[PDB]
Protein backbone atom coordinates (compact mmCIF):
# COMPACT_ATOMS: atom_id res chain seq x y z
CA UNK A 1 0.00 0.00 0.00
CA UNK A 2 2.78 2.49 0.81
CA UNK A 3 4.30 1.94 -2.64
CA UNK A 4 0.88 2.53 -4.22
CA UNK A 5 0.45 5.75 -2.24
CA UNK A 6 3.91 6.88 -3.34
CA UNK A 7 2.96 6.25 -6.98
CA UNK A 8 -0.31 8.15 -6.50
CA UNK A 9 1.39 11.10 -4.78
CA UNK A 10 4.11 11.60 -7.40
CA UNK A 11 1.56 11.51 -10.24
CA UNK A 12 0.37 15.01 -9.28
CA UNK A 13 3.83 16.51 -8.70
CA UNK A 14 5.39 19.43 -10.58
CA UNK A 15 8.72 17.99 -11.79
CA UNK A 16 8.00 16.37 -15.17
CA UNK A 17 10.72 13.72 -14.65
CA UNK A 18 9.05 12.54 -11.43
CA UNK A 19 5.63 12.58 -13.09
CA UNK A 20 6.85 10.45 -16.01
CA UNK A 21 8.51 8.01 -13.60
CA UNK A 22 5.24 7.83 -11.65
CA UNK A 23 3.36 7.08 -14.89
CA UNK A 24 5.76 4.22 -15.71
CA UNK A 25 5.51 2.79 -12.19
CA UNK A 26 1.72 3.12 -12.31
CA UNK A 27 1.72 1.14 -15.58
CA UNK A 28 3.75 -1.66 -14.01
CA UNK A 29 1.80 -1.83 -10.73
CA UNK A 30 -1.57 -1.65 -12.52
CA UNK A 31 -0.33 -4.54 -14.66
CA UNK A 32 0.36 -6.46 -11.45
CA UNK A 33 -2.19 -5.25 -8.88
CA UNK A 34 -5.99 -5.00 -9.10
CA UNK A 35 -7.17 -2.51 -6.45
CA UNK A 36 -4.38 -0.15 -7.52
CA UNK A 37 -5.76 -0.42 -11.07
CA UNK A 38 -9.24 0.87 -10.19
CA UNK A 39 -7.78 3.59 -7.95
CA UNK A 40 -5.49 4.80 -10.74
CA UNK A 41 -8.39 4.53 -13.21
CA UNK A 42 -10.41 6.96 -11.08
CA UNK A 43 -7.40 9.27 -10.64
CA UNK A 44 -6.64 9.28 -14.38
CA UNK A 45 -10.29 10.05 -15.15
CA UNK A 46 -10.32 13.06 -12.82
CA UNK A 47 -6.85 14.11 -14.05
CA UNK A 48 -7.51 14.00 -17.81
CA UNK A 49 -10.82 15.76 -17.09
CA UNK A 50 -8.71 18.32 -15.24
CA UNK A 51 -7.07 21.22 -17.05
CA UNK A 52 -3.71 21.38 -15.23
CA UNK A 53 -2.31 18.41 -17.16
CA UNK A 54 -0.42 19.30 -20.38
CA UNK A 55 -1.16 17.59 -23.69
CA UNK A 56 2.03 15.48 -23.81
CA UNK A 57 1.47 14.17 -20.28
CA UNK A 58 -2.11 13.32 -21.26
CA UNK A 59 -0.69 11.34 -24.20
CA UNK A 60 1.67 9.51 -21.84
CA UNK A 61 -1.17 8.87 -19.36
CA UNK A 62 -3.75 7.21 -21.62
CA UNK A 63 -2.09 3.75 -22.27
CA UNK A 64 -2.18 3.10 -18.52
CA UNK A 65 -5.84 2.17 -19.11
CA UNK A 66 -4.84 -0.90 -21.15
CA UNK A 67 -4.25 -2.74 -17.85
CA UNK A 68 -7.80 -2.21 -16.52
CA UNK A 69 -8.79 -5.73 -17.67
CA UNK A 70 -8.67 -7.15 -14.13
CA UNK A 71 -12.47 -7.32 -13.87
CA UNK A 72 -15.57 -6.56 -15.93
CA UNK A 73 -16.89 -3.44 -14.15
CA UNK A 74 -13.44 -1.80 -14.10
CA UNK A 75 -13.07 -2.50 -17.82
CA UNK A 76 -16.51 -1.01 -18.50
CA UNK A 77 -15.64 2.14 -16.53
CA UNK A 78 -12.40 2.43 -18.51
CA UNK A 79 -14.47 2.03 -21.69
CA UNK A 80 -16.71 4.94 -20.66
CA UNK A 81 -13.58 6.98 -19.91
CA UNK A 82 -12.09 6.20 -23.34
CA UNK A 83 -15.38 7.13 -25.01
CA UNK A 84 -15.26 10.45 -23.16
CA UNK A 85 -11.63 10.86 -24.29
CA UNK A 86 -12.32 10.30 -27.99
CA UNK A 87 -15.35 12.62 -27.82
CA UNK A 88 -13.67 15.52 -26.02
CA UNK A 89 -10.09 15.37 -27.39
CA UNK A 90 -10.48 14.90 -31.16
CA UNK A 91 -6.94 15.86 -32.24
CA UNK A 92 -4.79 13.25 -33.96
CA UNK A 93 -2.26 12.14 -31.33
CA UNK A 94 -4.58 11.41 -28.43
CA UNK A 95 -7.38 9.80 -30.45
CA UNK A 96 -4.59 7.58 -31.88
CA UNK A 97 -3.31 6.69 -28.40
CA UNK A 98 -6.77 6.35 -26.83
CA UNK A 99 -8.33 4.11 -29.47
CA UNK A 100 -5.18 1.96 -29.59
CA UNK A 101 -5.42 1.61 -25.80
CA UNK A 102 -9.11 0.71 -26.19
CA UNK A 103 -8.12 -1.93 -28.75
CA UNK A 104 -5.60 -3.47 -26.35
CA UNK A 105 -8.10 -3.34 -23.47
CA UNK A 106 -10.77 -5.06 -25.57
CA UNK A 107 -8.24 -7.67 -26.68
CA UNK A 108 -7.37 -8.41 -23.05
CA UNK A 109 -10.98 -8.25 -21.78
CA UNK A 110 -13.00 -10.25 -24.30
CA UNK A 111 -16.39 -8.96 -23.09
CA UNK A 112 -16.29 -5.66 -25.02
CA UNK A 113 -14.63 -6.85 -28.26
CA UNK A 114 -17.80 -6.56 -30.50
CA UNK A 115 -18.51 -2.93 -29.56
CA UNK A 116 -14.80 -2.16 -29.96
CA UNK A 117 -14.89 -3.58 -33.50
CA UNK A 118 -18.06 -1.57 -34.19
CA UNK A 119 -16.39 1.61 -32.90
CA UNK A 120 -13.28 0.93 -35.00
CA UNK A 121 -15.41 0.46 -38.12
CA UNK A 122 -17.29 3.68 -37.31
CA UNK A 123 -14.02 5.60 -37.01
CA UNK A 124 -12.80 3.98 -40.22
CA UNK A 125 -15.85 5.04 -42.24
CA UNK A 126 -16.44 8.48 -40.72
CA UNK A 127 -13.14 10.04 -39.58
CA UNK A 128 -11.40 11.83 -42.48
CA UNK A 129 -7.82 11.76 -41.20
CA UNK A 130 -5.49 9.31 -42.93
CA UNK A 131 -3.49 8.50 -39.78
CA UNK A 132 -6.59 7.64 -37.74
CA UNK A 133 -7.81 5.41 -40.57
CA UNK A 134 -4.45 3.62 -40.77
CA UNK A 135 -4.48 3.00 -37.01
CA UNK A 136 -8.02 1.64 -37.38
CA UNK A 137 -6.66 -0.73 -40.03
CA UNK A 138 -3.82 -1.87 -37.75
CA UNK A 139 -6.13 -2.38 -34.76
CA UNK A 140 -8.61 -4.38 -36.85
CA UNK A 141 -5.65 -6.44 -38.11
CA UNK A 142 -4.65 -7.13 -34.51
CA UNK A 143 -8.19 -8.12 -33.53
CA UNK A 144 -8.53 -10.35 -36.61
CA UNK A 145 -5.24 -12.05 -35.73
CA UNK A 146 -6.33 -12.41 -32.09
CA UNK A 147 -10.08 -13.20 -32.25
CA UNK A 148 -11.57 -13.80 -35.74
CA UNK A 149 -14.59 -15.76 -34.45
CA UNK A 150 -16.00 -12.79 -32.51
CA UNK A 151 -16.45 -10.84 -35.77
CA UNK A 152 -20.04 -10.60 -36.99
CA UNK A 153 -21.52 -10.47 -40.48
CA UNK A 154 -22.34 -6.78 -39.94
CA UNK A 155 -18.71 -5.93 -39.18
CA UNK A 156 -17.48 -7.66 -42.35
CA UNK A 157 -20.22 -5.91 -44.34
CA UNK A 158 -19.12 -2.53 -42.96
CA UNK A 159 -15.45 -3.27 -43.66
CA UNK A 160 -16.21 -4.28 -47.25
CA UNK A 161 -18.30 -1.13 -47.73
CA UNK A 162 -15.42 0.97 -46.36
CA UNK A 163 -12.99 -0.77 -48.72
CA UNK A 164 -15.26 -0.10 -51.71
CA UNK A 165 -15.85 3.56 -50.89
CA UNK A 166 -12.32 4.74 -50.06
CA UNK A 167 -10.24 6.00 -53.03
CA UNK A 168 -6.78 5.91 -51.42
CA UNK A 169 -4.56 3.00 -52.44
CA UNK A 170 -2.79 2.62 -49.07
CA UNK A 171 -5.98 2.48 -47.00
CA UNK A 172 -7.53 0.02 -49.46
CA UNK A 173 -4.39 -2.13 -49.29
CA UNK A 174 -4.41 -2.19 -45.50
CA UNK A 175 -8.10 -2.95 -45.06
CA UNK A 176 -7.90 -5.64 -47.73
CA UNK A 177 -4.98 -7.11 -45.78
CA UNK A 178 -7.27 -7.18 -42.73
CA UNK A 179 -9.98 -8.85 -44.82
CA UNK A 180 -7.49 -11.40 -46.19
CA UNK A 181 -6.33 -12.21 -42.66
CA UNK A 182 -9.98 -12.71 -41.69
CA UNK A 183 -10.59 -14.91 -44.76
CA UNK A 184 -7.92 -17.42 -43.71
CA UNK A 185 -9.95 -18.38 -40.63
CA UNK A 186 -13.53 -19.38 -39.77
CA UNK A 187 -14.77 -15.80 -40.28
CA UNK A 188 -15.94 -16.70 -43.81
CA UNK A 189 -18.28 -19.38 -42.45
CA UNK A 190 -19.71 -16.94 -39.89
CA UNK A 191 -20.14 -14.40 -42.71
CA UNK A 192 -22.37 -16.80 -44.66
CA UNK A 193 -23.30 -16.37 -52.93
CA UNK A 194 -22.71 -12.93 -54.46
CA UNK A 195 -22.28 -10.25 -51.80
CA UNK A 196 -20.21 -7.19 -50.93
CA UNK A 197 -17.14 -9.25 -50.00
CA UNK A 198 -17.19 -11.19 -53.28
CA UNK A 199 -17.66 -8.05 -55.39
CA UNK A 200 -14.88 -6.28 -53.48
CA UNK A 201 -12.50 -9.22 -53.88
CA UNK A 202 -13.22 -9.50 -57.61
CA UNK A 203 -12.77 -5.74 -58.09
CA UNK A 204 -9.53 -5.61 -56.09
CA UNK A 205 -7.91 -8.65 -57.75
CA UNK A 206 -7.69 -6.61 -60.98
CA UNK A 207 -6.53 -3.42 -59.22
CA UNK A 208 -3.36 -1.79 -60.53
CA UNK A 209 -1.45 -1.94 -57.24
CA UNK A 210 0.34 -5.25 -56.68
CA UNK A 211 -0.49 -5.57 -52.98
CA UNK A 212 -4.21 -4.89 -53.45
CA UNK A 213 -4.34 -7.50 -56.21
CA UNK A 214 -2.48 -10.02 -54.02
CA UNK A 215 -4.83 -9.55 -51.07
CA UNK A 216 -7.91 -9.67 -53.31
CA UNK A 217 -6.86 -12.90 -55.02
CA UNK A 218 -6.01 -14.34 -51.59
CA UNK A 219 -9.55 -13.50 -50.44
CA UNK A 220 -10.92 -15.24 -53.55
CA UNK A 221 -8.66 -18.26 -52.96
CA UNK A 222 -9.75 -18.57 -49.32
CA UNK A 223 -13.45 -18.15 -50.13
CA UNK A 224 -13.20 -20.75 -52.94
CA UNK A 225 -11.30 -23.35 -50.90
CA UNK A 226 -13.28 -22.91 -47.67
CA UNK A 227 -16.79 -23.58 -49.01
CA UNK A 228 -18.32 -25.38 -52.00
CA UNK A 229 -21.37 -23.19 -52.67
CA UNK A 230 -22.60 -22.89 -56.25
CA UNK A 231 -21.66 -19.24 -56.79
CA UNK A 232 -18.17 -20.05 -55.49
CA UNK A 233 -17.83 -22.79 -58.13
CA UNK A 234 -19.01 -20.20 -60.65
CA UNK A 235 -16.44 -17.59 -59.56
CA UNK A 236 -13.51 -20.01 -59.07
CA UNK A 237 -12.42 -19.35 -62.68
CA UNK A 238 -12.18 -15.62 -61.88
CA UNK A 239 -9.73 -16.35 -59.05
CA UNK A 240 -7.55 -18.50 -61.33
CA UNK A 241 -7.41 -15.94 -64.15
CA UNK A 242 -6.72 -13.06 -61.75
CA UNK A 243 -3.94 -15.18 -60.26
CA UNK A 244 -2.47 -15.66 -63.75
CA UNK A 245 -2.63 -11.89 -64.33
CA UNK A 246 -0.79 -11.25 -61.07
CA UNK A 247 1.77 -13.90 -62.06
CA UNK A 248 2.49 -12.26 -65.42
CA UNK A 249 2.64 -8.86 -63.69
CA UNK A 250 5.20 -10.01 -61.10
CA UNK A 251 7.26 -12.28 -63.38
CA UNK A 252 9.80 -9.55 -64.29
CA UNK A 253 9.32 -6.69 -61.79
CA UNK A 254 12.33 -7.87 -59.69
CA UNK A 255 11.79 -5.97 -56.44
CA UNK A 256 11.39 -7.21 -52.83
CA UNK A 257 7.74 -6.13 -52.73
CA UNK A 258 7.24 -7.93 -56.03
CA UNK A 259 8.94 -10.98 -54.50
CA UNK A 260 6.55 -10.88 -51.53
CA UNK A 261 3.48 -10.53 -53.77
CA UNK A 262 4.75 -13.36 -55.98
CA UNK A 263 5.22 -15.58 -52.91
CA UNK A 264 1.67 -14.76 -51.79
CA UNK A 265 0.23 -15.57 -55.23
CA UNK A 266 2.14 -18.85 -55.51
CA UNK A 267 1.07 -19.96 -52.03
CA UNK A 268 -2.51 -19.07 -52.94
CA UNK A 269 -2.47 -21.18 -56.10
CA UNK A 270 -0.82 -24.08 -54.23
CA UNK A 271 -3.69 -23.99 -51.71
CA UNK A 272 -6.26 -23.65 -54.51
CA UNK A 273 -4.80 -26.67 -56.32
CA UNK A 274 -4.89 -28.62 -53.05
CA UNK A 275 -8.58 -27.72 -52.99
CA UNK A 276 -9.49 -27.90 -56.70
CA UNK A 277 -7.64 -30.50 -58.84
CA UNK A 278 -9.65 -29.74 -61.99
CA UNK A 279 -8.48 -26.15 -61.52
CA UNK A 280 -4.99 -27.46 -60.64
CA UNK A 281 -4.54 -28.74 -64.20
CA UNK A 282 -5.00 -25.25 -65.68
CA UNK A 283 -2.85 -23.90 -62.82
CA UNK A 284 -0.05 -26.24 -63.92
CA UNK A 285 -0.57 -25.20 -67.55
CA UNK A 286 -0.25 -21.46 -66.85
CA UNK A 287 2.73 -22.07 -64.52
CA UNK A 288 4.57 -23.85 -67.34
CA UNK A 289 3.63 -21.15 -69.88
CA UNK A 290 4.97 -18.36 -67.65
CA UNK A 291 8.05 -20.34 -66.53
CA UNK A 292 9.95 -19.75 -69.79
CA UNK A 293 9.64 -15.94 -69.88
CA UNK A 294 10.01 -15.29 -66.13
CA UNK A 295 13.10 -13.91 -64.42
CA UNK A 296 15.58 -15.97 -62.39
CA UNK A 297 14.18 -15.35 -58.89
CA UNK A 298 10.64 -15.59 -60.25
CA UNK A 299 11.63 -18.89 -61.89
CA UNK A 300 13.01 -20.17 -58.56
CA UNK A 301 9.79 -19.34 -56.72
CA UNK A 302 7.71 -20.74 -59.60
CA UNK A 303 9.67 -23.98 -59.47
CA UNK A 304 9.14 -24.21 -55.69
CA UNK A 305 5.41 -23.70 -56.21
CA UNK A 306 5.31 -26.29 -59.02
CA UNK A 307 7.23 -28.77 -56.87
CA UNK A 308 4.61 -28.35 -54.13
CA UNK A 309 1.83 -28.78 -56.72
CA UNK A 310 3.38 -31.96 -58.12
CA UNK A 311 4.19 -33.41 -54.69
CA UNK A 312 0.65 -33.04 -53.36
CA UNK A 313 -1.19 -33.86 -56.62
CA UNK A 314 0.12 -37.00 -58.39
CA UNK A 315 -1.37 -36.77 -61.89
CA UNK A 316 0.60 -33.80 -63.21
CA UNK A 317 1.08 -35.00 -66.78
CA UNK A 318 4.43 -36.08 -68.25
CA UNK A 319 3.93 -33.34 -70.85
CA UNK A 320 5.26 -31.07 -68.11
CA UNK A 321 8.62 -32.88 -68.24
CA UNK A 322 9.39 -31.70 -71.78
CA UNK A 323 8.95 -28.02 -70.90
CA UNK A 324 11.03 -28.41 -67.73
CA UNK A 325 13.81 -30.17 -69.67
CA UNK A 326 13.78 -27.45 -72.35
CA UNK A 327 13.95 -24.75 -69.66
CA UNK A 328 16.80 -26.64 -67.94
CA UNK A 329 18.73 -26.75 -71.23
CA UNK A 330 18.65 -22.99 -71.92
CA UNK A 331 19.39 -22.09 -68.27
CA UNK A 332 22.65 -24.10 -68.49
CA UNK A 333 24.48 -21.00 -69.81
CA UNK A 334 22.39 -18.26 -68.18
CA UNK A 335 24.44 -16.83 -65.29
CA UNK A 336 26.87 -17.86 -62.55
CA UNK A 337 25.64 -16.52 -59.19
CA UNK A 338 21.83 -16.98 -59.13
CA UNK A 339 22.03 -19.89 -61.63
CA UNK A 340 22.81 -22.28 -58.74
CA UNK A 341 19.48 -22.12 -56.88
CA UNK A 342 17.54 -22.11 -60.15
CA UNK A 343 19.45 -25.24 -61.20
CA UNK A 344 18.73 -27.12 -57.98
CA UNK A 345 15.03 -26.13 -58.01
CA UNK A 346 14.70 -27.13 -61.68
CA UNK A 347 16.37 -30.47 -60.95
CA UNK A 348 13.96 -30.92 -58.03
CA UNK A 349 10.89 -30.40 -60.22
CA UNK A 350 12.42 -32.71 -62.86
CA UNK A 351 12.82 -35.50 -60.29
CA UNK A 352 9.36 -34.95 -58.75
CA UNK A 353 7.73 -34.93 -62.20
CA UNK A 354 9.52 -38.12 -63.31
CA UNK A 355 7.31 -40.62 -61.50
CA UNK A 356 8.99 -43.29 -63.67
CA UNK A 357 12.66 -43.89 -64.45
CA UNK A 358 14.85 -41.55 -66.51
CA UNK A 359 16.36 -41.71 -70.00
CA UNK A 360 19.11 -40.00 -72.04
CA UNK A 361 17.63 -36.74 -70.66
CA UNK A 362 19.52 -37.70 -67.47
CA UNK A 363 22.69 -37.83 -69.60
CA UNK A 364 21.88 -34.32 -70.83
CA UNK A 365 21.34 -33.13 -67.24
CA UNK A 366 24.63 -34.57 -65.96
CA UNK A 367 26.51 -33.25 -69.01
CA UNK A 368 25.13 -29.76 -68.37
CA UNK A 369 26.07 -30.04 -64.68
CA UNK A 370 29.65 -31.17 -65.37
CA UNK A 371 30.15 -28.54 -68.08
CA UNK A 372 28.65 -25.48 -66.37
CA UNK A 373 28.29 -25.89 -62.58
CA UNK A 374 31.88 -26.34 -61.29
CA UNK A 375 30.57 -25.83 -57.73
CA UNK A 376 29.75 -29.25 -56.21
CA UNK A 377 27.34 -28.10 -53.50
CA UNK A 378 24.59 -27.70 -56.08
CA UNK A 379 25.59 -31.12 -57.43
CA UNK A 380 25.22 -32.49 -53.89
CA UNK A 381 21.77 -30.94 -53.47
CA UNK A 382 20.60 -32.23 -56.87
CA UNK A 383 21.82 -35.73 -55.95
CA UNK A 384 20.07 -35.38 -52.59
CA UNK A 385 16.80 -34.51 -54.34
CA UNK A 386 17.34 -37.44 -56.73
CA UNK A 387 17.69 -39.82 -53.78
CA UNK A 388 14.64 -38.15 -52.20
CA UNK A 389 12.44 -38.80 -55.24
CA UNK A 390 13.81 -42.28 -55.97
CA UNK A 391 15.83 -41.46 -59.11
CA UNK A 392 18.71 -43.39 -57.59
CA UNK A 393 20.74 -43.92 -60.79
CA UNK A 394 21.11 -40.15 -61.20
CA UNK A 395 22.11 -39.91 -57.54
CA UNK A 396 24.73 -42.63 -58.05
CA UNK A 397 26.20 -40.81 -61.05
CA UNK A 398 26.34 -37.47 -59.22
CA UNK A 399 27.80 -38.89 -55.99
CA UNK A 400 30.43 -40.80 -57.98
CA UNK A 401 31.33 -37.59 -59.84
CA UNK A 402 31.42 -35.58 -56.60
Amino acid sequence: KNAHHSIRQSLDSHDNVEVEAAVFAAANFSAQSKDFAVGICNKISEMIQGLATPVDLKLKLIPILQHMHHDAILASSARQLLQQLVTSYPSTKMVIVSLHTFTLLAASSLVDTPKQIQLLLQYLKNDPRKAVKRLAIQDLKLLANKTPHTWSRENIQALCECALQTPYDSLKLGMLSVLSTLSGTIAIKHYFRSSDLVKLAQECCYHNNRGIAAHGVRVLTNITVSCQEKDLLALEQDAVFGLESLLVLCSQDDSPGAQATLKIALNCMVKLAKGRPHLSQSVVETLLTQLHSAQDAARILMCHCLAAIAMQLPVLGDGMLGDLMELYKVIGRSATDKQQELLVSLATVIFVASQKALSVESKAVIKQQLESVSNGWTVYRIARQASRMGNHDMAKELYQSL
Binding site: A260, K263, N267, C305, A308, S345
Partner: peptide, 27 residues
Protein backbone atom coordinates in the same frame (compact mmCIF):
# COMPACT_ATOMS: atom_id res chain seq x y z
CA UNK B 1 5.01 -14.09 -43.65
CA UNK B 2 4.20 -17.25 -45.64
CA UNK B 3 6.26 -19.89 -47.43
CA UNK B 4 5.59 -21.10 -50.97
CA UNK B 5 6.60 -24.72 -50.27
CA UNK B 6 6.49 -26.27 -46.81
CA UNK B 7 8.59 -29.37 -47.59
CA UNK B 8 11.25 -27.37 -49.44
CA UNK B 9 14.76 -28.55 -48.57
CA UNK B 10 16.58 -25.44 -49.86
CA UNK B 11 15.59 -23.46 -46.74
CA UNK B 12 19.04 -22.93 -45.22
CA UNK B 13 18.36 -20.26 -42.58
CA UNK B 14 19.28 -22.90 -39.96
CA UNK B 15 22.43 -24.80 -40.94
CA UNK B 16 23.62 -27.62 -38.68
CA UNK B 17 27.30 -28.25 -37.92
CA UNK B 18 27.52 -31.17 -40.37
CA UNK B 19 26.13 -29.11 -43.26
CA UNK B 20 28.13 -26.06 -42.09
CA UNK B 21 31.42 -27.94 -42.44
CA UNK B 22 30.22 -29.68 -45.63
CA UNK B 23 29.43 -26.37 -47.35
CA UNK B 24 32.71 -24.75 -46.26
CA UNK B 25 34.63 -27.89 -47.27
CA UNK B 26 33.94 -27.57 -51.00
CA UNK B 27 33.16 -23.90 -51.71
Amino acid sequence: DVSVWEENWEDDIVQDDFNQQLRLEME
